[PDB]
């Protein structure tokens, strides 16, 4: 078959034999490679080096993986770097995105003597024209060497190499796509210097003496003709947030069938079972109001009530939105204000004196001495012998106290939330909202820590009957309507919806943008909004807004589609009806012949490839019989207390960090278990601090990924992960080497010859700020736990009647071929999922005409809305499988070959308005632009020049926001006040002015202000405004107003409204 080399990081590398003559003028390197997640920083896949002499080194060309930011190692991309012998500098071109750490990538670097180009998956991602002429002279041809998978300085590579290919000519993009489609031998052509199959690795390649030869395995690179992974948008979180998946739910009414959802209301009782937290009257009234609200949206709620008789749990006060660490903090918090709280330990009470005097303790507890500054009467109030614990103890350091958090309540109750929507009750002193509702995409949505926390004081009240509908909408994946205006980081957030769309704001096209308000009407002027002074068609009547409960009475149909789609996606265990999930996307036409057509469809929206069995591991099994599981139990030693062994509830489930290179609370850290008062010990030198992650089902492993989120920026040592030791069930520890990690992409390890079953790993670290987000174990191709499960079946139903034998057969695989088509007839197809005897909802129908074109035909048809048309059905290129072009790609030819146009050298007319990098700032045909000269600023220093505003703007600089310190690289392009920092400007209020003069005094139709920073501090939520005054030749000021600063509006255009009289 087809064979692939596996290079590891230990130093396995090859070199080409001297008989093949290396190219000099033009070349093309084509290689199918499958990288791993953790790489050495300048990793080299293939390089052409010189061993003639160590003078004017790094000449030649090298393709590999390297980070864009060398001082941070954040963004690792494929690069191609060339330096010919006649040149004086080395030019490096990079791809447009971070490399995918587990997928096959067809890298192709070409050079024709004037242009060097890089193609990733057949789409051109970078080009350059700096390097000119041939690479090297024929006189120096003897000492040129071609290293594979390494270099002289052991810049090794971890991954698979399938089809190495070197050409003495620079092929066009069409020949690159042809060699991608046709993976056969190219040795018939005379221009092909070398193409490689790894049947005989000793023929044309010789390994190094120290580094052993890489092992040859079987690859199966071209496994799929349809990419079954659809990414969510930037503001979404799951497959349901995708536009093409939610469009089928919005269009088709067969998806929004009535569904029965089971939910549980939990009331706390004492041991006598006489005192309920919620009375049965308001429980029944809330159930009736809920079934009244959700009857018109085809959602049926089944009420269950569980009585918990615990006398100690009832006496406490359950705090919804408060934190036990905020009680001792002297900042007043509104939510922690109750009798059992102690008014935040007196911190919200003005009778608390600011001094700290520790009074003498004598006798009974005192209400005035129970505050924080009196040190809880010296601990007399928390003593059980003096008085009752449940009404007098306010010290959060004590093991027994008056108040209890709901996250501590759910650990005590340990309610199985996998089958019911658990409703919890807790008291909020601010009372403006309910408790925290867990989103469907959170890791706790099926665990015991997930549910809905409500306030029982307003439960089933005539003025407060709509809060449970709001929290149920939050638990079914609906955001607030004011998310796109009010719940954003700054005015430069990408999710700030200027217009209603499926990808911005609350991910609903029906709901217009709106701020947060308590009114039942349209608000007028508002300072919270950045640029929008007024709003119209505000959804005041929606359940998700901040209006009063009598005002909220309507759901948009898009929110209904989102709720039904999230009930199908993640909430299959709640519904008692075992109807399988539908295929959410229409079947796609892979290819057509003269007498047949081929159809392939996506997996169902549940994401499961096997039947539903409750007491087995059938939900862990993938398309094949592999098993993919996460770390069920975590154990790390407590650093201060010996043999403490604290259990991280984070770093267990699926990875759930938002910013992937930032310190987060959802990750395990070596110094997070300790108290603030104790000194955190450093990790030991020979081993380091370790995390022991245990998996639920021990099996034979083949892959192990670890989501290392945050690493230390100033890290002088080589590898953050010291080692990884797999724990076998036999007791043997199998140790791996120190693994290099990246911030963004997950670390991935391929495990060889691990015959014994592995139940867990131990990750050792010498870094005390390393954060591990999740671990994932992937088993071999045949797993004994997945052999018991039976797979789903698929049935293809056509709108013309099919044959009985063709319609009767249930397909195991997702491929369908029929020969019963007439040449002029039109056929609508769909696929129904059949698990056992029960069938699912129908998929959306694909309409196919046997003569006319379609999506994957290879010819662009503008009648069907196809902006691009390629036969790939692969989302990695510039053209989607839905035949719309991707972001910042342009496709030219009738068989659409696409190139990355946003950072290209040339400037074209269709990207003058969009791009500030390729072209200049866009000036219309009736206007002229003049830039400043000899400008003067308010604050001058030696570090900040102040004269950098003269002339053309810094178009290559990106716009930064939420930035603490502006001292990275922006001082050489733009002016900011050096002498005054943000805290010192906050302490003493000052006004900065920038006075820019112009050589030729003309009229001002508009003023263009180009900014590279919004000015937003990372701790302050306020927006920043700029005021512009035009100055005349008569020295008079004309005001142009206050304008907010957004990175979206990089060249701020301020229109001058001049009165014509």
């Amino acid at each position: 078959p087809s064979r692939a080399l596996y290079f590891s990081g230990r130093g396995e590398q090859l070199r080409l034999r001297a008989d093949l003559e290396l190219p000099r003028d033009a070349f093309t390197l084509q290689v199918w490679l499958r990288a791993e997640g953790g790489q050495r920083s300048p990793a080299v896949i293939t390089g052409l080096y010189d061993k003639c002499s160590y003078i004017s080194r790094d000449r030649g060309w090298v393709v590999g993986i390297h980070t864009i930011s060398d001082q941070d190692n954040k963004d690792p991309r494929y690069f191609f770097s060339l330096k010919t012998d006649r040149a004086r500098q080395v030019t490096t071109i990079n791809a447009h995105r971070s490399y995918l750490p587990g997928q096959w990538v067809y890298l192709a670097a070409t050079y024709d003597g004037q242009f060097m180009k890089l193609y990733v998956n057949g789409a051109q991602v970078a080009t350059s024209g700096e390097q000119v002429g041939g690479i090297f002279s024929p006189l120096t041809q003897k000492c040129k060497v071609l290293m594979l998978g390494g270099s002289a300085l052991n810049h090794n590579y971890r991954g698979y190499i399938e089809h190495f290919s070197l050409w003495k000519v620079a092929r066009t993009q069409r020949e690159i796509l042809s060699d991608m489609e046709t993976h056969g031998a190219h040795t018939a052509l005379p221009q092909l210097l070398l193409q490689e199959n790894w049947d005989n690795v000793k023929h044309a390649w010789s390994p190094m003496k120290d580094g052993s030869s890489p092992k040859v395995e079987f690859s199966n690179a071209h496994g799929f003709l349809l990419d079954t992974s659809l990414e969510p948008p930037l503001c979404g979180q799951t497959l349901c947030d995708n536009t093409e998946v939610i469009a089928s739910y919005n269009q088709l009414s067969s998806f929004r069938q009535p569904k029965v959802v089971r939910y549980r209301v939990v009331n706390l009782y004492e041991d006598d079972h006489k005192n309920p937290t919620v009375t049965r009257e308001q429980v029944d009234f809330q159930h009736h109001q809920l079934a009244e609200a959700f009857k018109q949206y085809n959602i049926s709620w089944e009420l269950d009530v569980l009585e918990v008789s615990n006398s100690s749990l009832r006496r406490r006060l359950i705090l919804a939105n408060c934190d036990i660490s905020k009680i001792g903090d002297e900042n007043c918090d509104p939510e922690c204000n109750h009798t059992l709280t102690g008014h935040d330990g007196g911190d919200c009470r003005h009778l608390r004196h600011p001094a700290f005097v520790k009074k003498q303790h004598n006798g009974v507890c005192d209400m005035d001495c129970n505050y924080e500054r009196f040190n809880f009467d010296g601990g007399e109030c928390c003593d059980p012998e003096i008085t009752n614990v449940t009404q007098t103890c306010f010290d959060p350091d004590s093991p027994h106290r008056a108040y209890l958090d709901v996250n501590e309540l759910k650990n005590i109750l340990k309610l199985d939330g996998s089958t019911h929507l658990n409703i919890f009750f807790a008291k909020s002193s601010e009372e403006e909202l309910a408790g925290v509702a867990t989103w469907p995409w959170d890791k706790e949505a099926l665990m015991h820590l997930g549910g809905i926390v409500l306030n029982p004081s307003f439960y089933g009240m005539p003025g407060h009957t709509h809060t449970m509908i709001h929290e149920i909408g939050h638990s079914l994946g609906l955001y607030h309507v004011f998310r796109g205006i009010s719940e954003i980081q700054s005015c430069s957030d990408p999710c700030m919806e200027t217009e209603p769309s499926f990808e911005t704001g609350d991910l609903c096209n029906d709901t217009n943008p709106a701020p947060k308000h308590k009114s039942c009407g349209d608000p007028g002027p508002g300072n919270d909004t950045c640029g929008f002074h007024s709003f119209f068609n505000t959804p005041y009547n929606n359940f998700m807004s901040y209006a009063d409960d009598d005002c909220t009475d309507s759901f948009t149909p898009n929110q209904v589609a989102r709720m039904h789609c999230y009930l199908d996606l993640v909430y299959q265990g709640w519904q008692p009806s075992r109807k399988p999930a539908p295929v959410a996307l229409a079947p796609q036409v892979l290819g057509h012949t003269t007498d047949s057509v081929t159809l392939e469809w996506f997996p169902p929206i549940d994401g499961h490839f096997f039947e539903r069995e409750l007491g087995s591991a059938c939900h862990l099994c993938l398309e094949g019989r592999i098993l993919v599981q996460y770390a069920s139990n975590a154990s790390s030693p407590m650093p201060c207390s010996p043999s403490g062994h604290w259990s991280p509830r984070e770093a267990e489930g699926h990875p759930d960090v938002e910013q992937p290179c930032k310190s987060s609370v959802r990750t395990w850290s070596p110094n997070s278990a300790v108290n603030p008062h104790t000194v955190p010990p450093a990790c030991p030198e020979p081993q380091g601090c370790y995390l022991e992650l245990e998996f639920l089902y021990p099996l034979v492993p083949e892959s192990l990924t670890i989501w290392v989120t945050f690493v230390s920026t100033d890290w002088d040592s080589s590898g953050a992960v010291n080692d990884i030791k797999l724990l076998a069930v036999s007791g043997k520890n199998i140790s791996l080497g120190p693994q290099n990690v990246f911030c963004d992409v997950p670390l991935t390890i391929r495990l060889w010859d691990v015959g014994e079953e592995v139940y867990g790993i131990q990750i050792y670290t010498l870094d005390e700020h390393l954060e591990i987000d999740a671990a994932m174990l992937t088993s071999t191709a045949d797993t004994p736990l997945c052999l018991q499960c039976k797979p789903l079946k698929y049935k293809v139903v056509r709108d013309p009647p099919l044959q009985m034998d063709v319609a009767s057969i249930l397909h195991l695989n997702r491929k369908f071929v029929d020969m019963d088509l007439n040449l002029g007839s039109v056929y609508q197809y769909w696929v129904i999922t059949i698990s056992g005897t029960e069938e699912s909802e129908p998929s959306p129908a694909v309409t196919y005409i046997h003569g006319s074109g379609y999506c994957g035909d290879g010819i662009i048809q503008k009648d069907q809305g196809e902006q691009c048309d390629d036969m790939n059905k692969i989302n990695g290129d510039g053209c989607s499988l839905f035949c719309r072009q991707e972001v910042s790609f342009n496709c030219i030819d009738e068989p659409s070959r696409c190139y990355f146009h946003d950072g290209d050298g040339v400037c074209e007319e269709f990207e003058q308005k969009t791009s500030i990098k390729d072209c200049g700032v866009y000036t219309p045909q009736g206007f002229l632009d003049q830039w400043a000269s000899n400008a003067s600023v308010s604050h001058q220093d030696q570090q900040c020049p102040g004269w950098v505003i003269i002339g053309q703007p810094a178009a290559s600089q990106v716009c930064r926001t939420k930035v603490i310190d502006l001292s990275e690289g922006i001082s050489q392009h733009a002016w900011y006040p050096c002498t005054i920092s943000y805290p010192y400007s906050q302490l003493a209020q000052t006004t900065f002015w920038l006075r820019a003069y112009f050589s030729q005094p003309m009229v001002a139709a508009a003023v263009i202000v180009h900014l590279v920073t919004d000015g937003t501090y990372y701790g302050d939520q306020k927006q920043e405004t700029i005021s512009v005054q035009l100055l005349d030749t008569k020295d008079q000021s004309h005001d142009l107003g206050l304008h907010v600063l957004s990175c979206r509006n990089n060249p701020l255009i301020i229109p001058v409204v001049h009165d014509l009289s």
């Binding site: 002429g133 002279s137 100033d714």
Partner: protein, 378 residues
């Protein structure tokens, strides 16, 4: 040096002419006091306004760089015709280099780079200069032809070693590399010290080489004070038989009085001062930051009824502040006398992995700099 074409034959107010230069020329499109960048496209269309030309279009020859040593190594360049397009230059190989190749001329080209050299200046390493008390161990290194970048091993005599060598690990062989310029790595088998004589008989000794290896020390006047340094580093025997000139803060306390061979404690009256032995060419305020002077612990009397560490010779200089090893760089302790403040002034050695001077206005590359030679920066 251009081709010009006008789409209109008649020249009137409004006509335009497109000029595109030939190969090997760089455009400089300019206006009146307006230096714009060069157009990437070859064709520029010029339109006359009010009977005058709005811009000046010129095409200079493309300036090849003056032929650097990084273009052809070990060569001297003579270019009489210049560095413009079409010019030629000659290169002559060095005296420790051989000129092999058909043509030794470099041509400036259209793209702006000099053409591929057809002659390769080949440098061959000759026989290395000899080293005293060392023997060459490689037989091919005695020849006059050698590869560039290889190592030739020279072994010292027993008792001769590289200075800075440890007592437990005395390494007696080193290697020198043929460098790029035809030279070699310098290495001398010079030992700093055989063994130090005891301080109780210091001052009257006269040696052949001082404290060096195989140095015969005699004291001018049973046995005598004549000893010979052995191969292991030891001697065959040992030597036998009121200070009013004090410093500004020097204090001596004698627990045994002024008897023969008694040891008295030395101290400085200032708390921030340390007592050292300064050399005659080394002053007080100009002590080098790389120098480690010998600190004084005790005064021990000699056989001539004198003091080995004479009190006048003892200088109480400004001692090290106790702020060492606190992840903080200080300008006072940034010297080998105070262990470069415990190595806190270098990024690779400080515990917090970031250099922070204690005053917020100090020279980071100057007085508060990293001067530790063991650090990875040096």
């Amino acid at each position: 040096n251009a081709s010009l074409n006008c789409s209109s034959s008649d020249r009137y107010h409004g006509a335009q002419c497109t000029v595109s230069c030939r190969t090997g020329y760089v455009l400089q499109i300019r206006r009146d006091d307006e230096l714009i960048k060069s157009q990437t496209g070859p064709s520029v269309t010029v339109t006359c306004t009010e009977g005058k030309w709005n811009k000046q279009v010129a095409c200079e020859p493309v300036d090849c760089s003056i032929p650097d040593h990084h273009q052809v190594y070990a060569a001297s360049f003579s270019c009489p015709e210049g560095t413009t397009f079409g010019s030629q230059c000659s290169f002559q190989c060095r005296h420790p280099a051989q000129l092999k190749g058909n043509n030794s001329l470099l041509t400036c080209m259209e793209d702006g780079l000099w053409s591929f050299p057809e002659a390769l200046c080949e440098l061959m390493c000759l026989a290395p200069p000899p080293v005293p008390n060392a023997d060459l161990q490689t037989a091919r290194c005695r020849e006059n032809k050698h590869k560039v970048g290889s190592f030739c091993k020279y072994k010292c005599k027993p008792g001769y070693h590289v200075p800075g060598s440890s007592r437990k690990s005395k390494k007696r062989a080193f290697k020198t590399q043929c460098t790029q310029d035809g030279s070699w790595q310098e290495g001398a088998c010079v030992p700093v010290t055989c063994d130090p004589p005891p301080p109780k008989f210091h001052g009257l000794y006269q040696c052949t080489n001082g404290f060096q290896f195989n140095s015969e020390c005699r004291i001018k006047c049973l046995g005598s004070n004549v000893i010979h340094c052995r191969k292991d580093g030891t001697w065959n025997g040992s030597f036998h038989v009121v200070p009013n000139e004090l410093n500004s803060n020097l204090k001596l306390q004698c627990p045994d009085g002024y008897a023969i061979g008694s040891e008295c404690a030395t101290s400085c009256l200032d708390h921030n001062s340390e007592s050292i032995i300064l050399p005659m060419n080394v002053t007080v305020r100009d002590i080098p930051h790389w120098l480690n002077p010998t600190r004084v612990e005790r005064v021990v009397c000699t056989a001539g009824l004198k003091w080995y560490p004479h009190p006048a010779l003892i200088h109480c200089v400004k001692g090290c502040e106790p702020f060492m090893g606190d992840n903080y760089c200080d300008a006072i302790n940034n010297r080998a006398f105070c262990n470069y403040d415990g190595g806190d002034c270098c990024t690779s050695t400080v515990k917090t992995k970031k250099v922070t001077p204690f005053p917020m206005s100090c020279d980071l590359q100057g007085d508060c700099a990293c001067r530790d030679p063991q650090a990875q920066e040096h």
